[PDB]
Design a protein around this ligand. Structure first.
Ligand SMILES: CSCC[C@H](NC(=O)[C@@H]1CCCN1C(=O)[C@H](Cc1ccc(O)cc1)NC(=O)CS)C(N)=O
Ligand SMILES: [Zn+2]
Length: 732
């Protein structure tokens, strides 16, 4: 746990790749050389072993020895760290660059008194790591680039002079990743100097004196973020890739060896959904329903995305202008709920583990349950084994299952292989913890991925964390896992650019609580700033998915802006109305049809809805999804306001005839406004007054004045009406 590693494990990596060849008195010669090589992180030494590279500690002219006499006068003038030109058979260290990694260092009595030589040695090692190893997993990259740039553009123009070459300094603009591609032979060069300085004790201080973050890179990279590379290296070698697999395969070679043909079938089913057969729908449709089905232009519906309709259409053909009808719509509304592929994992994602949620029929809600509790039981054997310590399992993901919003800009419009930097930062932003409430299907050895898949996880399991082994090298995890984003950086892999995410599994508790603890704080604040009972429940968090960390920190800004854009007077009045009926501000990431605040109030189920946000009079609560995008609505906040408008439309009306409560927009005066200008604002607004008012509103109180004007320019009377109830409510 401490000594057990570096000193006694080193000696092992010492005997294998560390080769000596002196002349006489075979003694202390191996000391300075063993001491010298000790100061370096043993883990880089193992990687050198990986790409297959031996080390030679000899005497005299190093070039006068076996492995290095091939290269001719072609390569004979090697430059040193500093830039001078020390020749080979006049030097003391070199490192062969080829499909047979070789590194030769001359002997010496004691590098203690000396310090500038060990430096060079350490520098060449650098070149090694920076050119023979990392070059095989696609580093240095964007993370290390970011540190080179900070170095060129800053206060002190001296730290540059310390690492930067006789040409990295001059380069006009910042170093673009594309640049790492054309001047690479130079970049690696630098990452090396930085290693040596950091490695060579006394020269370490100088680095922490004129090297801003350049030091902090090595500090981190050489103590904690190094393994995560030795690993990647290791996840490209064959025998090892399967070395590990069979090792795990074995640990479950008793579980997998005892499964009912109902068990395996349960696992597989989970892997691939199963769209319901035509024949079944038809027979179970009944008399008047089947008959109505015959004359219903499906394409005349708004809901029911392509996928669906183009399915319901096939029933009219096997059974053998724009305005539809609402008694007809009912039907399609019902079928929508029957033509859904039975998907276990997708079901859990929607309900967020809340499997007993009246979000679907009864006959089906109950199957998902039988199946689920059944899968949870098939998964009782924990990964934790006695054949391996940390286990890194990998998983590829589509950023859309995390944040639709950013997912629409995450890829760079012109070069689809690149990741738009800005977006990347707004994603990497408030991402500190992640929840998994469905069965995570991960791969034992990183395997490529699809297109929507640009996010590449890299999970560290808990020996506790129980899972299930799969034949194709994958593992099905237990549900309700607690992850913990430890580091997110951009990476290049196989001609492409992907987002690497590094998380550590931890009890859901650790995380489930961070959420409440926070939910608590955010209320133990927005009540003061509102004059409400400090022990009231205004804001509420409903979080159970992979992008949790953000569904909370975003709540803050959303309200933090909904405030800085409206008269605090209007707020207080309205939100007390909401508060008075147990109302709620729900920032959640489970299908909306799964929020108590909507289903405790719906007559029939096919009536429930799903969307970015929504306001319901009944519970007087604003519901806000998070992993989605409103018809082009850059910010989440916006939508939050569009819903507040509904709140306002409720209080006004209320204020009219105190008990026969009816939304303000159901006024004879408004419809006379919705009729005229009530169709010169938003494509949506064109729906119905109730919504128009909400659309109009949102704009009248947006962040972009640009949007505030148009409402007043194309929707005057409305700007009068809406801003009219305002001055009414503020007086109440
Ligand atoms: C169902 S997942 C989200 C889908 C997203 N949809 C929305 O934002 C839907 C589409 C129609 C309006 N949507 C709403 O969620 C609105 C909220 C809204 C408002 C304005 C806007 O530009 C976008 C969304 N809900 C309500 O008005 C119920 S109170 C989309 N890209 O189609
Ligand atoms: Zn609305």
């Amino acid at each position: 746990e401490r000594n057990k590693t570096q000193e006694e494990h080193l000696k092992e990596i010492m005997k294998h790749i560390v080769k000596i060849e002196v002349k006489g008195e075979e003694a202390v010669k191996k000391e300075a050389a063993e001491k010298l090589l000790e100061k370096v992180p043993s883990d880089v030494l193992e990687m050198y072993k990986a790409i297959g590279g031996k080390i030679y500690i000899v005497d005299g002219d190093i070039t006068k020895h076996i492995s290095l006499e091939a290269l001719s006068e072609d390569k004979k003038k090697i430059k040193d760290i500093y830039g001078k030109d020390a020749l080979l058979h006049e030097h003391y260290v070199y490192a062969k660059e080829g499909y047979e990694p070789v590194l030769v260092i001359q002997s010496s009595e004691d590098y203690v008194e000396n310090t500038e030589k060990a430096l060079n040695v350490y520098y060449e090692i650098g070149k090694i790591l920076s050119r023979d190893i990392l070059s095989k997993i696609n580093q240095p990259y964007q993370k290390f680039l970011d540190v080179l740039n900070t170095i060129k553009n800053a206060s002190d123009s001296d730290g540059q002079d310390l690492l930067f070459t006789n040409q990295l300094k001059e380069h006009p603009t910042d170093f673009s990743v594309e640049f790492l591609e054309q001047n690479s032979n130079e970049v690696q060069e630098v990452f090396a100097k930085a290693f040596a300085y950091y490695i060579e004790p006394q020269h370490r201080d100088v680095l922490q004196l004129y090297a801003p973050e350049a030091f902090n890179y090595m500090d981190k990279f050489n103590e904690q973020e190094i393994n995560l590379s030795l690993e990647e290296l290791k996840d490209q070698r064959m025998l090892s890739r399967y070395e590990k697999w069979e090792k795990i395969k074995q640990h479950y070679q008793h579980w997998s060896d005892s499964l009912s043909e109902e068990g395996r079938g349960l696992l597989k089913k989970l892997q691939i959904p199963i769209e319901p057969k035509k024949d079944d729908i038809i027979h179970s449709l009944s008399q008047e329903e089947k008959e109505l089905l015959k004359r219903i232009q499906i394409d005349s519906s708004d809901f029911l995305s392509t996928e669906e309709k183009e399915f319901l259409k096939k029933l009219q053909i096997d059974i053998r202008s724009n305005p539809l009808s609402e008694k007809e719509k009912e039907f399609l509304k019902k079928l929508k709920l029957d033509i859904q592929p039975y998907d276990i994992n997708q079901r859990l994602q929607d309900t967020g583990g809340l499997i007993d949620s009246p979000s679907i029929n009864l006959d089906v809600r109950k199957q998902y349950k039988r199946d689920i509790q059944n899968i949870d039981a098939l998964l009782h054997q924990s990964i934790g084994s006695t054949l391996y310590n940390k286990i890194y399992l990998y998983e590829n993901m589509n950023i859309n299952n995390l944040t639709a919003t950013l997912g629409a800009d995450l890829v760079d419009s012109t070069d689809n292989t690149k990741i738009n930097r800005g977006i990347f930062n707004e994603f990497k932003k408030n991402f500190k913890y992640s929840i998994s409430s469905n069965y995570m299907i991960v791969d034992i050895n990183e395997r490529p991925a699809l297109d929507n898949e640009r996010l590449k996880w890299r999970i560290q399991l808990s020996p506790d964390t129980r899972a299930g082994y799969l034949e194709n090298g994958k593992l099905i995890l237990q549900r309700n896992i607690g992850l913990e984003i430890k580091d997110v950086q951009i990476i290049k892999q196989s001609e492409k650019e992907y987002i690497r995410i590094d998380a550590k599994v931890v009890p859901k508790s650790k995380i489930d609580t961070k959420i409440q603890e926070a939910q608590l704080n955010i209320n133990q604040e927005w009540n003061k700033a509102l004059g409400l009972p400090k022990y009231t429940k205004l804001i509420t968090f409903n979080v159970h998915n992979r992008y949790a960390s953000n569904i909370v920190e975003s709540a803050y800004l959303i309200l933090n802006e909904w405030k800085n854009n409206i008269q605090s007077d209007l707020i207080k009045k309205v939100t007390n109305y909401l508060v008075d009926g147990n109302g709620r501000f729900v920032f959640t990431d489970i299908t909306l049809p799964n929020i108590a605040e909507q289903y405790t109030h719906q007559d029939e189920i096919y009536e429930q809805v799903h969307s970015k946000g929504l306001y319901v009079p009944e519970s007087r609560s604003i519901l806000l999804h998070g992993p989605s995008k409103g018809v082009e609505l850059r910010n989440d906040s916006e939508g939050f306001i569009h819903e507040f408008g509904h709140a306002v439309d409720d209080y006004a009306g209320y204020l009219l005839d105190k008990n026969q409560s009816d939304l303000v927009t159901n006024s004879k005066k408004f419809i006379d406004i919705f009729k005229e200008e009530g169709s010169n604002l938003t494509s949506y607004g064109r729906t119905n007054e109730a919504e128009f008012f909400a659309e109009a509103f949102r704009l009248m109180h947006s962040t972009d004045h640009a949007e505030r004007l148009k409402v007043q320019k194309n929707a005057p009377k409305t700007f009068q009406f809406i801003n009219d109830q305002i001055k009414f409510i503020i007086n109440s």
